[PDB]
Amino acid sequence: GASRLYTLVLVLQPQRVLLGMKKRGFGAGRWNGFGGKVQEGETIEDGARRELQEESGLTVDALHKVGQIVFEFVGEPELMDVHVFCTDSIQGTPVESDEMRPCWFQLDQIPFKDMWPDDSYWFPLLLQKKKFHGYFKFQGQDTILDYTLREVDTV
Numbered sequence: 492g493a494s495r496l497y498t499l500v501l502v503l504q505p506q507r508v509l510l511g512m513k514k515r516g517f518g519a520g521r522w523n524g525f526g527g528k529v530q531e532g533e534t535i536e537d538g539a540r541r542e543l544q545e546e547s548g549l550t551v552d553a554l555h556k557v558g559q560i561v562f563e564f565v566g567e568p569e570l571m572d573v574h575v576f577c578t579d580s581i582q583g584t585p586v587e588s589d590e591m592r593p594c595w596f597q598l599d600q601i602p603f604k605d606m607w608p609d610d611s612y613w614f615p616l617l618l619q620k621k622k623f624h625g626y627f628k629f630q631g632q633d634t635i636l637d638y639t640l641r642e643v644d645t646v
């Protein structure tokens with residue numbers, strides 16, 4: 492059915508990944524990658540690049556598509572169609588703003604308990620350079636009712 496396009500960008504380097512603690516809005520209190528809605532007349536990749544700069548202060552060269560995840564919240568008519576990207580070549584330094592507080596995390600210290608619960612399923616694939624298609628059904632913001640997750644050759 493009808494789905495709204497979102498982007499999600501993980502700045503993932505060999506020994507660390509950047510996450511930002513979302514200060515306000517839906518899902519505040521959790522460490523997120525950077526992203527959001529795509530604009531009219533904007534390609535998905537261009538929106539991910541824009542949202543990364545807007546939210547982290549970072550400029551990136553190459554963006555690699557690594558996943559597509561569809562989220563359903565029970566009772567909510569709009570599905571979230573989230574296009575996940577990764578990058579390791581960035582320019583700039585992340586900046587705390589009144590919307591997000593950024594921190595680098597060692598790969599063995601990902602704060603899964605303070606992240607969206609679906610991250611525990613697909614972040615491991617992201618970390619092993621796998622690509623994936625995912626679907627997660629939520630009841631509220633805390634409980635996964637069911638899900639599917641499949642490794643793919645083409646996102």
Ligand SMILES: Nc1nc2ccccc2[nH]1
Pocket residue numbers: 518562571607609610
């Ligand atoms: N990983 C992740 N980021 C999300 C943002 C909104 C709803 C569900 C989500 N799962």
